[PDB]
From a paper:
RAF-family kinases are activated by recruitment to the plasma membrane by GTP-bound RAS, whereupon they initiate signaling through the MAP kinase cascade. Here we describe cryo-EM structures of a KRAS bound to intact BRAF in an autoinhibited state with MEK1 and a 14-3-3 dimer. Analysis of this KRAS/BRAF/MEK1/14-3-3 complex reveals KRAS bound to the RAS-binding domain of BRAF, captured in two orientations. Core autoinhibitory interactions in the complex are unperturbed by binding of KRAS and in vitro activation studies confirm that KRAS binding is insufficient to activate BRAF, absent membrane recruitment.
Addition of the KRAS GTPase domain (KRASGTPase, residues 1–169, stabilized in its active state by loading with the non-hydrolyzable GTP analog GMP-PNP), to the autoinhibited BRAF/MEK/14-3-3 complex resulted in formation of a stable complex, as judged by co-elution on size-exclusion chromatography. The elution volume was little changed as compared with that of the autoinhibited BRAF complex alone, suggesting that addition of KRAS had not triggered conversion to the active dimeric state. A single-particle cryo-EM reconstruction at ~4.3 Å resolution revealed that the complex indeed retains an autoinhibited configuration, with KRAS bound to the BRAF RBD domain and extending “up” from the 14-3-3 dimer, positioning KRAS alongside the C-lobe of the MEK1 kinase domain. The density for both KRAS and the BRAF RBD was somewhat weaker and lower resolution than the remainder of the complex, indicative of conformational variability of these domains, but we were nevertheless able to confidently position both domains. Comparison of the present RAS-up and RAS-front structures with our previously determined RAS-free autoinhibited structure reveals that the constellation of autoinhibitory interactions among the CRD domain, C-lobe of the kinase domain, and the 14-3-3 dimer and its cognate phospho-serine recognition sites is unchanged. Indeed, considering the apparent flexibility of the KRAS/RBD unit in both structures, we do not ascribe a particular significance to either the RAS-up or RAS-front conformations. Rather, they appear to be two orientations of the mobile KRAS/RBD module that are sufficiently populated to allow 3D reconstruction. Thus it is not surprising that the RAF/MEK/14-3-3 complex is maintained in its autoinhibited configuration when bound to KRASGTPase, as this KRAS construct lacks the C-terminal hypervariable region and prenylation site. Considering that the KRAS-engaged BRAF complex maintains its autoinhibited configuration, the structures described here are best considered as “recruitment complexes” or views of a pre-activation intermediate.
Residue numbers in the entry:
A (entry chain A): 155 to 201, 204 to 282, 360 to 370, 449 to 738
B (entry chain B): 38 to 274, 307 to 383
C (entry chain E): 1 to 167
D (entry chain C), E (entry chain D): 2 to 230
The structure:
Amino acid sequence: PIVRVFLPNKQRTVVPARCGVTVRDSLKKALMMRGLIPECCAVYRIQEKKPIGWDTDISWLTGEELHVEVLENVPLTTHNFVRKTFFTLAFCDFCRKLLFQGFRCQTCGYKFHQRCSTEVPLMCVNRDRSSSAPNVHDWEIPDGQITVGQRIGSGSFGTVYKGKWHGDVAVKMLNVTAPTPQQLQAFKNEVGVLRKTRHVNILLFMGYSTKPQLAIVTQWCEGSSLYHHLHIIETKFEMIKLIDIARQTAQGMDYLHAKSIIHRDLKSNNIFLHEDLTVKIGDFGLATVKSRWSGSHQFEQLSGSILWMAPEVIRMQDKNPYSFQSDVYAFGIVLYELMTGQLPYSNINNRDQIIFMVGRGYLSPDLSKVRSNCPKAMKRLMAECLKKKRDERPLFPQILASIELLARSLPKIHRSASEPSLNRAGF
Amino acid sequence: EELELDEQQRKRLEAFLTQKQKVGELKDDDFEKISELGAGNGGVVFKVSHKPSGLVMARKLIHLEIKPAIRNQIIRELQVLHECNSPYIVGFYGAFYSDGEISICMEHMDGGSLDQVLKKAGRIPEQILGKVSIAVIKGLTYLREKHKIMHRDVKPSNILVNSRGEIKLCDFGVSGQLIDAMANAFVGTRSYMSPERLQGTHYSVQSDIWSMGLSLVEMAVGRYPIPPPDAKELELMPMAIFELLDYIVNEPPPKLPSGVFSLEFQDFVNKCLIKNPAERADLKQLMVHAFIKRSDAEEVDFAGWLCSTIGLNQ
Amino acid sequence: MTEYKLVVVGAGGVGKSALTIQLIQNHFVDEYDPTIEDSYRKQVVIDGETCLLDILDTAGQEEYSAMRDQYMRTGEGFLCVFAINNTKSFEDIHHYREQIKRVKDSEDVPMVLVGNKCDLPSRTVDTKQAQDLARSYGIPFIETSAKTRQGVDDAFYTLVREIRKHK
Amino acid sequence: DKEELVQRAKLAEQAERYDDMAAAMKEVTETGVELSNEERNLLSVAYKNVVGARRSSWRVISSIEQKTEGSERKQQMAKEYRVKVEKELREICYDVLGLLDKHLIPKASNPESKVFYLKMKGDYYRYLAEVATGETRNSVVEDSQKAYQDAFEISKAKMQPTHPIRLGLALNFSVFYYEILNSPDKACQLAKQAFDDAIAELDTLNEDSYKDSTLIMQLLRDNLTLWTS
Amino acid sequence: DKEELVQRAKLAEQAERYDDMAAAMKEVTETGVELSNEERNLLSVAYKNVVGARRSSWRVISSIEQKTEGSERKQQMAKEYRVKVEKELREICYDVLGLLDKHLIPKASNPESKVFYLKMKGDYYRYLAEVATGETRNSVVEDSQKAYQDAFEISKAKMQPTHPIRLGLALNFSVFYYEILNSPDKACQLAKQAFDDAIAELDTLNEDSYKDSTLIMQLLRDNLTLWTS
Ligand SMILES: Nc1nc2c(ncn2[C@@H]2O[C@H](COP(=O)(O)OP(=O)(O)NP(=O)(O)O)[C@@H](O)[C@H]2O)c(=O)[nH]1
Ligand SMILES: Nc1ncnc2c1ncn2[C@@H]1O[C@H](COP(=O)(O)OP(=O)(O)OP(O)(O)=S)[C@@H](O)[C@H]1O
Ligand SMILES: Nc1ncnc2c1ncn2[C@@H]1O[C@H](COP(=O)(O)OP(=O)(O)OP(O)(O)=S)[C@@H](O)[C@H]1O
Ligand SMILES: O=C(NOCCO)c1ccc2cncn2c1Nc1ccc(I)cc1F
Ligand SMILES: [Mg+2]
Ligand SMILES: [Mg+2]
Ligand SMILES: [Zn+2]
Ligand SMILES: [Zn+2]
């Protein structure tokens, strides 16, 4: 008289069917061997699955097949909550609105409103008053003026030639050969959108030309890319310098989103470190030259690199996968690259496998390779930026604000922790 | 010898070795580009000639920004090719680094890759296909014995031929560091990796066998087998990449249509496309396959047929 | 990350289950509860790699060899266990190796020879016999005691290393 | 030299010591010289911090008072604490109003500074009223009405429908309406009109003020959505 | 009477207003009535809030002091402000220290209360030494070491090593060693020993003492991780 038992984690065992012996006593040894306890698990019999008591005699179950499923009764969990009110710009992590009076975790810095308490994640993973007024603190250059420069490199959709037009200018030779009239019109519209733009941290857009094939003319930049300094010379950066770079990079993304233009291609190659101090970004927008047209349509064709692509843009089940969340995810990968100094997925050499495992959600960037001097708040920010779902990702105003807060909080957090406070919360 | 090489193959190998002995150091200024042979996924191939010797060779340039240490490591790893000598491998001359570019000097092949031949021919006769498979198996065996290296990138684009009918392989993964470097370069349209290797489990040449079988099927049908032809698509005798990968992982593999292909060939491709890599036969078991025996028994004037199909005058 | 399927085989009573339970839970079972089938999972770092071990502990009683054969077919490497006080269990290592060859349809299967119960007095299978048998198959020999835990990790970790070599 | 006081207040800002900052800026106000655009922000923020802290204290005390509903003198003690903090808040607001009406209102060369000062006056009257109860509440409500009307007229006349000051003034006026007059219809109408005006010039967003304007607009949308009920 | 003071202190803590609560607890302990652990926890938290805020302010001010050197004589007035802040800190520190000798240390009825008071004395000695210099700092740190050793000996001889209070005492002692003796080796060894002792005594505590231990152990792991380099 024996009973065959199926166990979680695709395991199994057989126990004898002795009279006077319960199922719980029979399987206690197996559960202890497998780090489980009967009280936190359920037992079912095949008859399709019928739950039975743990105290049931195994003798009456002779010849039967049993299955064990783990229960869930005590999530428990907690954070160290201290009441506090922020006098600068801040937002609830859950409710995404302005935050004047609420609660704060001393552990990780999670902030939420009084009314948002029941929605806070359980695991410390590392008639109301209205709001108020918070504190305050046709442009084609004619031919004969473009100096055909020297070939430099070829990217996802273009080629680089540094020419002369009233000084050094950057010219990108597009890989598109035959633009459709509708495609040409849309290209002109987007160029006109870009022309009336100007910012300290965005490269100037300087028109275009169409006589010598079709190419884009932009302001040339001196120096080198971020990707070079992170992985060519392997020059390390200090916390102040690194967070400053991140803050500057985020500064321009808010501007671009304010003018309602999706970057779609923020990879570490596309960030310049001009004059060794100022972050400048180029090579953005241009929806026309990507997703090669089959006619009067531009059905989405994937192109470029895959490390900085978000899961949804890979999945391609959405009509307009390139949304603000794509730029958010790109910024997350950029933060990770700056913080670790190692490219993501450094243990997989098959790009097909990388694509597949990103698409099914099975693989995410490492979170243990971070250094041991980065404050936990930046880790929380980085973790939040890389969420699989696109709905819960933050938008760039919030990330800019949190970066600003953690930056101004820098001088006091360098030293080690001291004595922590007690619970000081009511639940 | 020490191998099963006839007089012709041995003599041609000796001649190529003698030609290599006439080639010394390689530099950028030592070669002049004659024509472009095609652009790769992250590079391009140019027909070049070594002016100090006048020999016309094939040169592939790879653009990948890496640190000098990795460059020198790849240079050291590339030196193994000198001891590699087999009729089934594209001849090489050498490689060097210059101008932030990776250049490799290899034997120029006038026959071109199988992709252009298939494009200009539509479909390939089974007799022609059978001859290539045995040479592929022998080359894979040579690589696995002499160097224990799995190609991992077996596809029609990596097979070159000549007007003489000889078949050789290339683009093998000899340098693992270079393999890792090219991993994060750009994106492709269609792939051929085995479903198990997508799961992080290594089974060496089983994936190569699986990829070879699918490549042979595609060359036989004149269409990418994924997705399988539907009704009128099969009667003719823009899918997303993620869709293709998921379909490959979670669908039964396709098969040759009945009647138009010999049952031995259908059994061979079924064995070569077993979903379980463990159940898939190895090179030894595939060698003793009845279809392979028939192919060996058969004799085909492949060189003349290829010249006629391309249009070359003998 | 890396999963290894390990099968423990050998004659009844040699200590297959006691060895497995020492690996999984660091506890020695002194009772003799004959196995019909038992499988376990254990995550362990071996040579710097985080390994998921599936341990398939089989019946020594030949009455249940059909179940044993189903476990063997899924396995990647085999611990072939005898007891140092049971000469027939030692002689029957040949039987178990032949079973592995039959079920795996291969003569090239990772295997480690384990001589268990080395804490006992009056040992009757000597070191020279055991090392000669392991040598005859080209496999490692590990002495173990499930009671003292001597050799337990070495036996399983060596098998993992043999599987890696074979891959 | 007032610049020394300016630097002192700037240091105190990051020092998070707001009482000393308030006193230092009050000294500069007492100097009786016309202020710059920059210093006005510091003054407003400095007083706003203290007023907001006191407001939060009053809110939590009132919430506790509504919560207890017992029979004990703890409620009386809490009410005494509430009246004490209300008294000190009244003193602070009176000081701010006096300084404003004696130095800033009399000397307003540029209309924008006048609009800002009137907005401050109205918001501080609202701060008074939210604890005020009785005839004095009605009087300060009327004074806030006058200030808001005066500011709104000049804003509609000589201020773009995109500049942040006008947006904040509209927000404050809407809040004052919704809280004091409890007239959601007109407040919603004003909010919709202001949002439409802002959307009209959705392009004219220069480097100087891009995030603040859109942040205010988002807050307006949120309040309108909340008021839809 | 005293219960009314307790309610007042709880209300103040809820409203985050601290100085009034500090004075209330000071008079509560000056009354000389029996003091329980729950009551003194409120006093400790109250003093901790203000002292930590002012410590942060001093740290920021000192950072700004050395932020710029080749400039005008504004660093001079900045350091004058810093000295004023330091004097303010010294006054409250002296009051706190004298409070122990007045009521806490003499009215010592239970060993864990003595451990708690000595730990507080050492912590505030370290706080003073943060700004103290020279012979005064040396004397203060010697006094801190004396209290540290006395508290640790009693903790070792009397109660279990798995209680959170002992863990906090060890952590603070290690931090003091790092910040004064600057001996990473001795402090690291002591921290590792304490962590191992805590790990040995696991799964043997009460329902209430299941969360404090987690935070303390996490902090210990963080300190060891940072100090390993
Ligand atoms: N002294 C000693 N006894 C051991 C050792 N290993 C196992 N035993 C004892 O030998 C008996 C059989 O052990 P067990 O692990 O059940 O053997 P098994 O090979 O799994 N038997 P089966 O094939 O029936 O499943 C038990 O009484 C066990 O305590 C050992 O190393 N030393
Ligand atoms: N404004 C610029 N000034 C200087 N160099 C530039 C400028 N824009 C592009 N480049 C160079 O262009 C090279 C390759 O072209 P890019 O398209 O910028 O790179 P890329 O990232 O491969 O292309 P994409 O579309 O961004 S993926 C880079 O390595 C830069 O050195
Ligand atoms: N040995 C060769 N002899 C003659 N032509 C060759 C040879 N190798 C490559 N070519 C040609 O050059 C082109 C570019 O080389 P490839 O590296 O094969 O490009 P590719 O096919 O895009 O790269 P993959 O990785 O194989 S898809 C090929 O498509 C052929 O037309
Ligand atoms: O060429 C390659 N991939 O294709 C490029 C995209 O078309 C390739 C790919 C991997 C690799 C590892 N070590 C060398 N490797 C290559 N080089 C190579 C190998 C053999 C010959 I013979 C000539 C060669 F250039
Ligand atoms: Mg190729
Ligand atoms: Mg057993
Ligand atoms: Zn938390
Ligand atoms: Zn919220």
